[PDB]
Each structure stands twice: as structure tokens, then as C-alpha cells.
Design a protein around this ligand. Sequence first.
Ligand SMILES: [Ca+2]
Ligand SMILES: [Ca+2]
Lengths: 224, 224, 58, 56
Amino acid sequence: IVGGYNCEENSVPYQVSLNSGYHFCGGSLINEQWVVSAGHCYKSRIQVRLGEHNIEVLEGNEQFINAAKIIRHPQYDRKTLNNDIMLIKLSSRAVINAHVSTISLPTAPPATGTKCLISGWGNTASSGADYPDELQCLDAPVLSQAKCEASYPGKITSNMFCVGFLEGGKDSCQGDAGGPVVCNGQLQGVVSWGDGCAQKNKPGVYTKVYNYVKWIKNTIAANS
Amino acid sequence: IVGGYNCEENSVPYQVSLNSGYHFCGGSLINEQWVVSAGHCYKSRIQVRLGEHNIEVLEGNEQFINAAKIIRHPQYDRKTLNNDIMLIKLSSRAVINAHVSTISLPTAPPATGTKCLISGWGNTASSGADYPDELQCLDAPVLSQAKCEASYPGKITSNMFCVGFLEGGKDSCQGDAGGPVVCNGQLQGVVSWGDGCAQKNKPGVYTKVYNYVKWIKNTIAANS
Amino acid sequence: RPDFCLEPPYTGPCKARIIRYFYNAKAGLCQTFVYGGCRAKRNNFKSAEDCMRTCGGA
Amino acid sequence: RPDFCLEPPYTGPCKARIIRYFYNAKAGLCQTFVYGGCRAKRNNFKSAEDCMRTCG
Ligand SMILES: [Ca+2]
Ligand SMILES: [Ca+2]
């Protein structure tokens, strides 16, 4: 997260870190045994780390739970990045408390101008490397489809939307993918891609979770 | 730098000292052969000192390279301080290593609330004089255009911005001009001017490097 | 060694932080870099061993 | 000697550390001060010698 702030002043209990010997992507706890993330975060085995603030220090609220099932969207496209979403079934149920809890699925699509909270352990620099130990947060608004399309002509599918600032300066970045965009207590977006990070006229592109609610519910039911 | 701290050794490897017989301004290394500084730091002969931590003693990692070309912005105004920027071409290429390396140009203009690192060998006292041997650092946020204009009515052009604290106490000061303001890992500002240092409702004013990206790239290409 | 070994590493537009290896030809070694998760070029290896076998003559 | 010469020294708003001279009250001597690089007032000299002359 470039241009954000330390989440220690906020409650972000649905944020998870996906670990393969190190943090490589975020995710969102949507059920006691299921996480939503990005399809480009797929690995054949993933350890989900819940209850984290500082990913380098044991603080005492962590749960580390390995994936039992990892299900990339079947129509994920590795060139166009369409259908950039994945579900992870935990091998055991997360214990729900103040530090680890679920985020509601969206009941209606992203709304232009709504302020949303984006979070993650991604790069905090637009050039070079500045990766944080502590979870970062950014408040950013949903942008209109016209602005999203003008920023990325021909590259925005119906399953994508932009959140951020056309002036640049604040954005999600490498290490944030898979993590949450939450608007009014609902998970609206999965951090996906962009042209770099925090560049003028290049806001981040996010997967529209609302377009996948039936896929998510069906997948959970079929794997329970 | 008033209200700052001793920079960790090697943490600001793009910082240079401009020397005319003594340290008089800072600068930023943007390419193996080019330094950005302020236009009011112009002198006809300048020795660029790279790899410095303590400017009073040789510590072994210094490179001293004379300016070959010194190109102040052609629209520099010595009364209003508009276009307060200059490029220096080094007489030989800096050796890039752990102590000396470049800072990226900005890919967005300054964003309110983002965190910046300001550095230099300027005065550390808000009144009177206390000049340091060791490079000083200061963490400070970009301020809104409205706050900048309120702090300096009728004096802030679109090529200026403010970083710091309306409450004073922490600021850049004499001896810091020309040096870097780095935000999100990119060179957002050049230390320029202010009414005193660290005074209430008088944050420092900085040259907005983003507005000079085309000029910098064109000037480099024209002089290579 | 393949000519793709001489190309600079490519992070791409996706926003993961996956640690991959690339061959740094002058340094004669494989180095780590951040891969974003999509649109990989060929100088991008999941391990140092894969990188050295392909570009380092192992 | 010119009048401005009783005027104190003016650093100005710019942030250089440029060592200049200013002619000194009743010391009958020029002293150094820090000039910031812009908006100089007249008691501001690039050398002790033209300070002494303009103000001796
Ligand atoms: Ca921890
Ligand atoms: Ca030294």
C-alpha cells in the first residue's frame, strides 16, 4: 500500500496473509473455513495466516492454517486477467474473536464515489522497495467506469473496477494482491493489477466480488 | 533540518553535498551523471560530494566530482522563486555502490498526507545556529494546497508545494536547499524556501519536481 | 545460454509479491526479484537451481 | 560610508548556507553571516574587502 497508514488505529480482522515461506499475497476471510483471494495468487499449497498485524513478530493472536483446497476461478485468464479470483478452503475452522473474523459478501455492486478501505502488506514505495512489517491501510473511492476505461483503454473487463485517485500518489502495490477492498462493511474488491502503483492516471484495478457471489456460494456448498 | 534525527549511515545514498569551498546546498543524484538541486544554489563552479555522512571528515566512501555543466531552469525567478530548480551534469560518472545510488523521478505529483523523508546538513536550530557534521533526516507529510496557500498568501505557484507541520517545530533550514524530499520512494521535492524555519504556520516550501520531469529528460538528452 | 537470460527481470502488472530468480549475466549469478504473479517473461525462475541450470551452465 | 551599513544582516527565505560578510555596528569590521541565497538586503558582501570599502 503506497501512501496509506498503519492499520494499528483500525480493526481489520478479516485480512489474511498468504504465506509460502514468506508473505506473497493477501486474502479475506469470508467464512470460518474459507478465504477469498486473487487468481494470480494461486500456488498449489498455501499457509493462511490470520490474526496478523506485524507479519515478522509473533504477537499472540495468530492462527496459521494450511489450505485443504485451493480453487482458482475456472475461467481465470492469465493474459487478460479476467476472473481474477480464487477461493481457499482452510483445513480447520478459524477461531472467531476480535482479531479474526469474517467480512460480509456484497449484496450490491461497487458504487461510484463510495469510500473503501484497502489493506495489505505490499510495497509502500512507487519506485524501489519499502516493504512493511505492519499492515497498511488506505481509504480510497470507487471510480466511475468512464475513468477506469480512460485509464486502461480496452483492458477493463466487466469483472473489473478501479478504486483510487487519478492524480496517483496512493494505491495498492505488489504484495497487496488478493487482499480486501471493503466498502460499508462489505467485501467489494480483490486487489488485482495496475500499471505500476500510484502513477498518475493509473489507479489500481480490482476484481468485482459482487459478480462472483453465486460462484462463491456454489463452490462452498460443493466442497463442504 | 530542525527537529530531525541523525540519518542511518548509507540510508540516503542519493543525497549529495554541493561544495564551493564549504557545504552550501544539497542535491539529489538522479542518474550516474546528473544531479538535481535548487536554482538559488547556482554557482558557476560546484564540486559535488557523494557518499557523505560526516561532511567534516573523510570516512572513505566519498566521491568528489566537479560539475561539468550547470543548467538552471530558464524561467527561474530570483524574486518569486518560481522554477527553483537546476541540473548539474557531473564531469565523470558516479560509481554506484552501497553508499552512492540514484533516486527515481516522480510518477505522480505530490499527494496530500503522504509521508516524505527530507534530508540535509542544514541548521538544526529554529533560532540561532547549530550546524551539524552528520547528515540529518526528517519525516514529514505533504500538506494540502489550501494549507500551503494559507501559510504564504499570494506566493505559492503551481510549481511549489508544502511539506511539514503548521504547528512548526520540524522543518528544513539554511543549508538544506537543493536537497531531496522523497515520498513513496521518488523525488517529489527540492528544498527551496520558507519564512524562517520550523515556525508556526510556516512550513517549508518545495519545488514540485513532477512538473519538471519533461524538462529534466529533455535537458539530459540534449546534453549527453 | 538462451538469449532471454540477458534480459532484465520483469515484475509485471499484477500485485503479488512472489520471490523469483533471474539471471544477472555480468554478475554470473542468479538473483532474487519481485514477480507480480502474471505475464512472466522467460528470465524468471522458481528456484536458484532452475535458473543456474538454464542460464548458468549447471 | 553608505547608510545601509548599520542595518543588521538578512538571511532571507531561501535555504542555502552561503557565507557572506556584513559590516559591523561599532566594531569597524566586517563579520560573516549565513545568507540563504535570495532577496539580499544591501549589508551583504561577497568578500571582507568590498565590505570594508562600502562600509569601512
Ligand atoms: Ca505476527
Ligand atoms: Ca565525509
